[PDB]
Amino acid sequence: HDPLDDIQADPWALWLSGYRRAAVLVALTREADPRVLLTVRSKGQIAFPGGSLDAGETPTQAALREAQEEVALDPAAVTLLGELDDVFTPVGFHVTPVLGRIAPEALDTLRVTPEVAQIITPTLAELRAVPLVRERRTLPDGTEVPLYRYPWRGLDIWGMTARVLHDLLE
């Protein structure tokens, strides 16, 4: 059990960018029409493979470890491309989106562990074409903040995940 999973399911926790640390792996396939590896947690919580860093662990190590423990993605099958800006929520959670590239075929033999119900791979083009939901909420200090939702194939990608997805698409 991970605290990141609790906070991620909180409909009201706001996420933005620009003390508890975590990381998510954002794997993109090496192809003309790039897909992104996402999971549906055992409506299920849609999220990137990931979780809190253990003691002495870096964001990258956590991201790679989580993707391997969750869907059996071999770290060596991932080319690290750097990370997007950290996304965070007021309470005290910082998430580092660790970017990586995999061969499209790598997706075929992944295996879901009990924590994950299924593996979904939206194409970046599809996420871009979907009727994005753009809302806004105000933080305690008066700071406005955008909130996104990506309606894909009947599933609702919201919260921290949609926030990273949006930074990624930009």
UniProtKB/Swiss-Prot annotation:
Protein name: Nudix hydrolase DR_1184
Molecular function in Gene Ontology: coenzyme A diphosphatase activity; magnesium ion binding
Organism: Deinococcus radiodurans (strain ATCC 13939 / DSM 20539 / JCM 16871 / CCUG 27074 / LMG 4051 / NBRC 15346 / NCIMB 9279 / VKM B-1422 / R1)
Keywords, comma-separated and alphabetical: Hydrolase, Magnesium, Manganese, Metal-binding
Catalysed reactions listed for this entry: CoA + H2O = (R)-4'-phosphopantetheine + adenosine 3',5'-bisphosphate + 2 H(+)
Coiled coil ranges: none
Domain of life (superkingdom): Bacteria
Gene3D superfamilies: Nucleoside Triphosphate Pyrophosphohydrolase (3.90.79.10)
Required cofactor(s): Mg(2+); Mn(2+)
Summary of subunit composition and partner proteins: Monomer.
Motif annotated as Nudix box, chain positions: 51-72
Entry EC number(s): 3.6.1.77
Family: Belongs to the Nudix hydrolase family. PCD1 subfamily.
